[PDB]
């Protein structure tokens, strides 16, 4: 009744980078309540949506969605790599991005 959330919100942290060269193709995601890569194994392959709201109304709504998926873990803290269909605009660093449970193993 009060909640309708069938996803986990998580921050678009950054692009994959060295000190001087960043890859816009791979994006970095912080899933809330995940500190270990073993917990992030649960989130492998899961379908991700970045939800944002446009000014114009494209098809019956002003809200648009980018999609993509988790590929692999990144680092020790449970930070998670992600690849989308189109890359992110990078002004969405630190933005809330929805991570859905399908494709569910359980």
């Amino acid at each position: 009744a009060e909640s309708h959330r069938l996803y986990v919100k998580g921050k678009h942290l950054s692009y994959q980078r060295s000190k001087r060269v960043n890859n816009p193709n791979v994006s970095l995601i912080k899933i809330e309540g995940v500190a270990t890569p073993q917990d992030a194994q649960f989130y492998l392959g899961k379908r991700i949506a970045y939800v944002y709201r446009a000014s114009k109304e494209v098809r019956g709504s002003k809200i648009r969605v980018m999609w993509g998926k988790v590929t692999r873990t990144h680092g020790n803290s449970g930070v998670v790599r992600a690849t989308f269909r189109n890359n992110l605009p990078a002004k969405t660093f630190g933005a809330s991005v929805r991570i859905f449970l399908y494709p569910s193993n359980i």
Partner: protein, 184 residues
């Protein structure tokens, strides 16, 4: 997990808290830092006094911590400016934040990071020693706040004591045992 995070500054280190907050603002978490005058610096008063001196060749503790924090963020970028626009810093706890809980950052605590038998430095004494003539104004407001907060906490403890009594008399019921069966 929280929209606006309210962080007390009492008993904390400058740079470690600055690093944590500077990371979270670039992560997008909105942060207000309160009671800034009670931040603590490693080393004695005098060393840190000379460090502010040879830097100086703004006196408020908020300006000091803002300086330290702004050094860690790439401030010239638009993203860094948005991250700084997420931030609020206050000496003392002004309203409305007095009525809300203040979290602490354990990896920046003085009592955990410092070995006992080390000199530290209070930021408010430092600011007053370098020309911030408002520290007595702070403690005067904070004394009234602690009075009203002690009143609030004394009321809150009595009411939760009543809640404890009501939960105690709610016990031994079969719905309570079924919660016990489910674990609650």
């Amino acid at each position: 997990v929280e929209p606006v995070v309210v962080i007390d500054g009492k008993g904390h280190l400058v740079g470690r808290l600055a690093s944590v907050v500077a990371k979270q603002l670039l992560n997008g978490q909105k942060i207000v830092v309160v009671r800034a005058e009670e931040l603590n610096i490693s080393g004695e008063f005098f060393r840190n006094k000379l460090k502010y001196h040879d830097f100086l060749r703004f006196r408020a503790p908020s300006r000091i911590f803002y300086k330290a924090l702004r050094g860690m963020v790439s401030h010239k970028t638009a993203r860094g400016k948005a991250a700084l626009e997420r931030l609020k810093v206050f000496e003392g706890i002004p309203p409305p934040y007095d009525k809300k809980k203040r979290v602490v950052v354990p990896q920046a605590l003085r009592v955990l990071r410092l070995k006992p038998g080390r000199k530290y430095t209070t930021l408010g004494k430092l600011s007053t020693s370098v020309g911030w003539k408002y520290e007595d104004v702070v403690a005067k407001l904070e004394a009234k706040r602690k009075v009203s907060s002690a009143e609030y906490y004394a009321k809150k403890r009595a009411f939760t004591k009543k809640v404890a009594s009501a939960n105690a008399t709610a016990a031994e019921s079969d719905v309570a045992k079924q919660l016990a069966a489910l674990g609650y």
